Design a protein around this ligand. Structure first.
Ligand code: CLA
Ligand code: CLA
Ligand code: CLA
Ligand code: CLA
Ligand code: CLA
Ligand code: CLA
Ligand code: CLA
Ligand SMILES: CCCCCCCCCCCCCCCC(=O)OC[C@H](COP(=O)(O)OC[C@@H](O)CO)OC(=O)CCCCCCCCCCCCCCC
Ligand SMILES: C/C(C=C=C1C(C)(C)C[C@H](O)C[C@@]1(C)O)=C/C=C/C(C)=C/C=C/C=C(C)/C=C/C=C(/C=C/[C@@]12O[C@]1(C)C[C@@H](O)CC2(C)C)CO
Ligand SMILES: CC(/C=C/C=C(C)/C=C/[C@@]12O[C@]1(C)C[C@@H](O)CC2(C)C)=C\C=C\C=C(C)\C=C\C=C(C)\C=C\[C@@]12O[C@]1(C)C[C@@H](O)CC2(C)C
Ligand SMILES: CC(/C=C/C=C(C)/C=C/[C@@]12O[C@]1(C)C[C@@H](O)CC2(C)C)=C\C=C\C=C(C)\C=C\C=C(C)\C=C\[C@@]12O[C@]1(C)C[C@@H](O)CC2(C)C
Lengths: 162, 177, 171, 185, 75
């Protein structure tokens, strides 16, 4: 709800509940960090959901193609390694956050090269944000549908449980 | 400013009044093509060649179907299928006719391109007036108009006869009745 | 926008500021590594490097050595551990000779200033010159670095052997 | 506006077109796309200033109205008999005559002839886009001559567009109902 | 045949290779393909390089697909 990147045509500066009208710059940076992290994690989660459903080469097959079921089938020592890798990545991100000129979601340090941003750079950042938002909605829907129905995405669609 | 044939269309720029049969009927503006060696001269020469070929073909079909074939030639009343009967027994006639037409068409193309280049020959002109039917003017324009109209009608007729013979495998007047 | 620019505004260096050389991720990741982590003595840097290196070095020797075993064998583990320790010894010998022939300094970040201020009209290359201002760039610093590498390599190799034995036995 | 009074106007329905009352709730008469490019995909001519979507829509509406009027006349005719004085047209209603005649090679001939006429008059539309003074739906077709007396021409215009709208809706009903006033579902 | 109706030659129709190349810039590539059209229309050696490289690669691909799927009877 500022001159921040992420304002698109359907709803420009979409803050209907006024979360940003009262927040300071630090809280807004925190909100942008949370939104970008959620969007990236959700894009990965949606892609993994679908691909796992129609392709699970690892673990010598097995590891039932329905997600939320393979969640309880991974050896639980591979879960620990994924957890530790995510933790090390976020430790590195925390270290990045104290670098001078840091921008909320910018872990590549594009502020080093991008002074006086263009419209293409802002448009690409907005594209990433919008894809992340769509993936957040999609992954929430995926998890809820798999919980209530018990079938996965391409399985529920194939049968016709819509 | 509006074409005489199509009042809802502006006058085609390249068709003023000169050519016989000109009524401004160029809805697609094909007369303005000036590429791939195609222009108004080439289009008019092609139209006149088509007119003459269609006139000859329609006259031949009607003659053979009405008055019958010449002695020693096959019958059948289907002109699109009697060709293969002639070729089955007199292939040399067909081959010689094809070679003659090929040579005459090479000459025709050379003449068309030359007359287009050093403008001295009107499109479709081959100086073929052995009987002197079009020597004087004020009759040449009327003869050109008659030839163009008859040739367009015979073009349409000959295309119709070709399609009818290919599809129905019957004679033209056989399809008529 | 352009994501490649001359390094530090010098178009004549043989280097470029690409999204890999000078990215914030690269900065933080290289600044958390023992070789560049702030607040570490050269002995601590050497110890951490040796620990990590012995830890991942025992792996290939134990797994693919001349005395492998598809099951767990104490002889295979001992062979891999000894090979890793001897390789660490060879690396420590290389470090020692490299430091012996490279530096002649016992306290850096000062001698450079002393010869930039109080003149250096001597045989040079010890008073003047002096490449690098890190504590690793001294005779004393590199000696402690090699000592730490060697001790940490032994400790990390032993720890990795213990972990391998535990994983092969209790899993 | 004069219809749907709680909406002022689309933007381009000033009144320069006949049969204008202002009814356009969706604002379809403001699309910036020049639909002549659906015919000539490129600008082609440097003098092609462009054709407003409103004029293209008016031409389409007039053409639709004429098509629907002739269509309802034909569909009503084949419900009450009235077959062509020739064989192979016996009785097969209107819901089935279309397919049986598409089979018998003459609907293709009709398609070719209608396409020829459509191409000529679409060349007229393209010239209008180029900037000819010809108005939408004006093919200068007044053979019998009941088109003089400009007041009569304007009245007949509004009449033709209103009748075309009525005929469009009536044909939609007739084809949807499979005829009820003269036949059964 | 469809692919042959792509580039603008003599009518107001088709593509200009100069306009296509000059529009393909990027953050990592500076000016992008600007000037490549002038390079490939003024240097026979550049055209020979591209054509010969792709031609040899095509020959190797042909060699593979030949034995892989024998296209001739009794070969
Ligand atoms: C939130 C992300 C996420 C999570 C938690 C999982 C979780 C899981 N996946 Mg998976 N997957 C994901 C995304 C994810 N996936 C994506 C995006 C793809 C497409 C390439 C796949 C493709 C995939 C296949 C083909 C298979 C799994 C399988 C599995 C299961 C076993 C773990 C495994 O072998 O992973 C394997 C994961 C991969 C091969 C690809 C992971 C690539 C990661 C997500 C991208 C890089 C991450 C990086 C380290 C951190 C980002 C850096 C920066 C942005 C900060 C487990 C339930 C296996 C299974 O049993 O299926 C039922 C299996 O066979 N996944
Ligand atoms: C640094 C290198 C390294 C090494 C040596 C290992 C070693 C191992 N990993 Mg592993 N892993 C690593 C990095 C590494 N990981 C990273 C960076 C990730 C991404 C988070 C993972 C994610 C991962 C998963 C998800 C799984 C393993 C598993 C395994 C084990 C089985 C591998 C195998 O082929 O059987 C010999 C083995 C102990 C598997 C395991 O422990 O199951 C028994 C398993 O499921 N790994
Ligand atoms: C085999 C020898 C031969 C040769 C070399 C030529 C050479 C020529 N003929 Mg030709 N012609 C020949 C035999 C030959 N003809 C025969 C046997 C006939 C039938 C009696 C014709 C009937 C004929 C007509 C009616 C016309 C020509 C035309 C031409 C000229 C244009 C050539 C061109 O670009 O066509 C390219 C070749 C094509 C096949 C393109 C035509 C494609 C159309 C669209 C086919 C439509 C079919 C539909 C049902 C050229 C001088 C034209 C001309 O002089 O224009 C100025 C012209 O209008 N010829
Ligand atoms: C486009 C012109 C054209 C073409 C291609 C043909 C083609 C043909 N005619 Mg023909 N004909 C034409 C005009 C044409 N005619 C005209 C204008 C007349 C009226 C004067 C005739 C009168 C005619 C008769 C009376 C006969 C033919 C016959 C034939 C066929 C064998 C003769 C032959 O090879 O012709 C080339 C012949 C010469 C150059 C001589 C052949 C299919 C014969 C046939 O088999 O018909 C079934 C036949 O008996 N034609
Ligand atoms: C030049 C004028 C002309 C004339 C008088 C005719 C006359 C005729 N055509 Mg015809 N036709 C023409 C041009 C012409 N065609 C053209 C230019 C073409 C396209 C090349 C055709 C293609 C054509 C086909 C494909 C058929 C006819 C058929 C017929 C006959 C049936 C008429 C009808 O309404 O049946 C309806 C009739 C004798 C039909 C026929 O022979 O009936 C048995 C038939 O099947 N015509
Ligand atoms: C939208 C107009 C339209 C269309 C598509 C048809 C279609 C049809 N009618 Mg038909 N009809 C119409 C209007 C129409 N009618 C009108 C308005 C009347 C009353 C005058 C009739 C009276 C009528 C009778 C009496 C019969 C048919 C029949 C038929 C069918 C057989 C014809 C056929 O196979 O195609 C042939 C091809 C076409 C119909 C395409 C039309 C091409 C025209 C001829 C080109 C010229 C149009 C004209 C010049 C427009 C002038 C405007 C402008 C130039 C100024 C066919 C389904 C016959 C049948 O068996 O039906 C069950 C039948 O017996 N119709
Ligand atoms: C097959 C030959 C042919 C050709 C070349 C044309 C050519 C043309 N027609 Mg046309 N028409 C034809 C046959 C043909 N007609 C026949 C047989 C009918 C009677 C069904 C019509 C009924 C018709 C109407 C009612 C209209 C045209 C229009 C047009 C013009 C625009 C076409 C366009 O944008 O793409 C057309 C491409 C489409 C995909 C058609 C749209 C279909 C809609 C979206 C769905 C409707 C339900 C099905 C153009 C001059 C329009 C015009 O003049 O606009 C100013 C117009 O309003 N035509
Ligand atoms: C493969 C990587 C890739 O092609 O990404 C594509 C990446 C994007 O570059 P640009 O966006 O600037 O390209 C835009 C135009 O130049 C189109 O070519 O190109 C590079 O950065 C080259 C670096 C190669 C590094 C090799 C590893
Ligand atoms: C480069 C060139 C010439 C030239 C040049 C020059 C030389 C350089 C000089 C100038 O400077 C330029 C230029 C361009 O003019 C081109 C040559 C022309 C071509 C390419 C010739 C094409 C002729 C094809 C024809 C005319 C075939 C017609 C077929 C029929 C079939 C008849 C049937 O009876 C058959 C057989 C079976 C029956 O069941 C039924 C049917 C189907 C009706 C009707 O007849
Ligand atoms: C080309 C030709 C015939 C070609 C026929 C062909 C290809 C047919 C081939 C086929 O049928 C076969 C064979 C077998 C079938 O299974 C296959 C096909 C293909 C169907 C005849 C030319 C025939 C050519 C002829 C008759 C030429 C006559 C020339 C004369 C009279 C010249 C006179 C002059 O030369 C003088 C005397 C003095 C000069 O100064 C002035 C003039 C006037 C020029
Ligand atoms: C829906 C429709 C029109 C709807 C109009 C509406 C809602 C208008 C509403 C308003 O006016 C009111 C009420 C009041 C105004 O103040 C406000 C508005 C809003 C303006 C037309 C459908 C129109 C639908 C049509 C025309 C469908 C035609 C289908 C045909 C002709 C099929 C032909 C065949 O060929 C096949 C396909 C197969 C062959 O085998 C058989 C046959 C049958 C021969």
């Amino acid at each position: 709800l500022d001159g921040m990147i992420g304002s698109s045509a359907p709803f420009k500066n979409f803050d209907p509940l006024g979360f940003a009208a009262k927040a300071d710059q630090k809280t807004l940076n925190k909100y942008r960090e949370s939104e970008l992290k959620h969007g990236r994690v959700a894009m990965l989660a949606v892609l993994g959901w679908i691909v796992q459903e129609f392709w699970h080469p690892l673990y010598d097959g097995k590891l039932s193609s329905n997600p939320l079921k393979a969640l309880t089938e991974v050896p639980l020592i591979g879960w620990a390694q994924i957890f530790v890798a995510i933790n090390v990545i976020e430790y590195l991100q925390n270290k990045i956050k104290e670098l001078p000129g840091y921008r909320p979601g910018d872990y590549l340090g594009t502020w080093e090269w991008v002074e006086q941003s263009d419209e293409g750079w802002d448009s690409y950042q907005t594209k990433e944000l919008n894809n992340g938002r769509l993936a957040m909605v999609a992954i929430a829907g995926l998890i809820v549908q798999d919980l209530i129905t018990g079938q996965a995405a391409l399985e529920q669609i194939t049968a016709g449980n819509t | 400013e509006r074409s005489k044939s199509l009042p809802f269309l502006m006058k085609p720029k390249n068709l003023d009044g000169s050519m016989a049969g000109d009524v401004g009927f160029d809805p697609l503006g094909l007369s303005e093509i000036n590429d791939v060696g195609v222009d108004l001269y080439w289009l008019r020469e092609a139209e006149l060649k088509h007119c003459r070929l269609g006139m000859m073909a329609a006259a031949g079909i009607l003659f053979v179907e009405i008055l019958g074939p010449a002695p020693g030639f096959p019958a059948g009343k289907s002109q699109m299928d009697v060709f293969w009967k002639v070729y089955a027994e007199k292939p040399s006639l067909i081959g010689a006719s094809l070679a003659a037409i090929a040579i005459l068409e090479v000459i025709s193309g050379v003449a068309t391109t030359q007359g287009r280049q050093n403008g001295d020959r009107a499109p479709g002109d081959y100086n073929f007036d052995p009987l002197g039917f079009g020597k004087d003017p004020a009759k040449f324009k009327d003869l050109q108009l008659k030839e163009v109209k008859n040739g367009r009608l015979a073009m349409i007729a000959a295309a119709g006869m070709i399609l009818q013979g290919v599809s129905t495998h019957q004679g033209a007047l056989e399809n008529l009745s | 926008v352009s994501f490649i620019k001359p390094y530090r505004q010098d178009p004549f260096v043989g280097h470029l500021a690409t999204p890999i050389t000078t990215s914030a991720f690269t900065r933080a990741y290289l600044k958390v590594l023992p070789a560049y982590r702030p607040g570490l003595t050269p002995l601590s840097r050497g110890a951490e490097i040796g620990f990590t290196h012995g830890y991942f070095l025992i792996g290939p020797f134990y797994t693919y050595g001349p005395l492998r075993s598809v099951e767990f064998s104490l002889t295979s583990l001992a062979a891999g551990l000894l090979a890793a320790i001897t390789l660490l010894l060879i690396l420590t010998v290389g470090l020692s000779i490299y430091g012996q022939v490279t530096y002649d300094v016992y306290d850096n970040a000062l001698i450079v200033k002393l010869v930039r201020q109080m003149v250096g009209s001597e045989r040079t290359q010890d008073l003047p010159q002096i490449k690098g201002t890190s504590e690793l760039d001294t005779v004393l610093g590199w000696q402690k670095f090699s000592e730490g590498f060697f001790s940490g390599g032994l400790i990390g190799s032993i720890v990795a052997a213990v972990g391998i034995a535990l994983y092969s036995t209790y899993l | 506006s004069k219809a749907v009074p709680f909406l002022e106007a689309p933007k381009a329905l000033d009144g320069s077109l006949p049969a204008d009352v202002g009814f356009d709730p969706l604002g379809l008469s403001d699309i910036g796309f020049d639909f002549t490019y659906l015919m000539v995909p490129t600008k082609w001519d440097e003098s092609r200033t462009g054709l407003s979507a409103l004029k293209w829509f008016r031409e389409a509406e007039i053409k639709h109205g004429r098509f629907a009027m002739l269509a309802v006349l034909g569909w009503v005719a084949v419900d009450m008999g009235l077959r062509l004085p020739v064989a192979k047209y016996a009785g097969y209603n209107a819901v089935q005559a279309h397919d049986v005649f598409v089979k018998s090679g003459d609907m293709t001939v009709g398609l070719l002839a209608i396409g020829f006429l459509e191409v000529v008059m679409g060349a007229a539309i393209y010239e209008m886009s180029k900037g000819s003074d010809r108005a939408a739906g004006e093919f200068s077709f007044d053979p019998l001559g009941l088109g003089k007396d400009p007041s009569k021409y304007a009245r007949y215009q509004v009449s033709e567009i209103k009748n075309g709208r009525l005929a469009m809706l009536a044909f939609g009903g007739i084809a949807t109902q499979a005829v009820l006033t003269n036949s059964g579902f | 045949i469809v692919a042959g109706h792509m580039y603008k030659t003599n009518w107001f129709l088709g593509h200009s290779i100069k306009t296509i190349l000059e529009a393909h810039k990027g953050p990592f590539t500076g000016e992008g393909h600007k000037g490549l059209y002038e390079v490939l229309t003024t240097s026979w050696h550049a055209q020979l390089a591209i054509n010969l490289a792709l031609f040899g690669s095509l020959s190797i691909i042909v060699a593979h697909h030949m034995y892989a799927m024998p296209p001739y009877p009794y070969i």
